[PDB]
Amino acid sequence: MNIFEMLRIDEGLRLKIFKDTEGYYTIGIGHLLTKSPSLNAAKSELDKAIGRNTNGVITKDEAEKLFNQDVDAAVRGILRNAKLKPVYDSLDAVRRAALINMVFQMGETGVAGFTNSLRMLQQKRWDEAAVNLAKSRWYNQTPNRAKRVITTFRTGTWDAYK
C-alpha cells in the first residue's frame, strides 16, 4: 500500500464530469474542477487542466496525470505550510500518507486549521488524536473515509485499506 493506492481507494475513478460528495464538479481520481454551479465553468477548467477541448470526457491516462499532479500538490502544500510541516516531519511514512490524504480531500488551509488534532499527532497521542479528529464536519459528512484515515493515524498501519 502507498499514498497513490490509498487515495485511489478513497476517491475512485470516473472519466466523465460528475459531482463529488459536496456537490462540486469533479473528474478522474477526485480532481476537483470548480465549486461553481456552472457546468460550463467546470468544462472550461477541465479543458485548461488537460490542454485540449474535452467536452467533459477524459482518458484514464489523463486522469492519472491530474492525479499525479494533485498528490504532488498536496505534499507541496504540507511542506510549505508552517502548521503542517512540523507535524509531517514528526510522523512515520504511513501516518504521513494519512496527512497527505486529508490535505488532498480538504486542502492545505483546511487541514492546517485542525490545530488541536495536529498537536495531538505531534505529541504522538494516537488514541486521543483519533478521538479529536472525529469531532469534525469532515468525519460527519464522510464517516467511512474519515474512519479509514483516522485508523491509519491511530495505528500507523494500513489495516483500514486491506
UniProtKB/Swiss-Prot annotation:
It is found in: Host cytoplasm. Changing residue 20 to A/N/S/T: Complete loss of enzymatic activity. Keywords: Antimicrobial, Bacteriolytic enzyme, Cytolysis, Glycosidase, Host cell lysis by virus, Host cytoplasm, Hydrolase, Viral release from host cell. It catalyses: Hydrolysis of (1->4)-beta-linkages between N-acetylmuramic acid and N-acetyl-D-glucosamine residues in a peptidoglycan and between N-acetyl-D-glucosamine residues in chitodextrins. Endolysin with lysozyme activity that degrades host peptidoglycans and participates with the holin and spanin proteins in the sequential events which lead to the programmed host cell lysis releasing the mature viral particles. Once the holin has permeabilized the host cell membrane, the endolysin can reach the periplasm and break down the peptidoglycan layer. The active site is at 11 (proton donor/acceptor), 20 (proton donor/acceptor). It comes from Enterobacteria phage T4 (Bacteriophage T4). CDD domains: T4-like_lys. This is Endolysin. Coiled coil: none annotated. GO terms for molecular function: lysozyme activity. The keyword Hydrolase applies. InterPro entries: Endolysin_T4_type (IPR034690), Glyco_hydro_24 (IPR002196), Lysozyme-like_dom_sf (IPR023346), Lysozyme_dom_sf (IPR023347), Phage_lysozyme-like (IPR052619), T4-type_lysozyme (IPR001165). It comes from the Viruses.
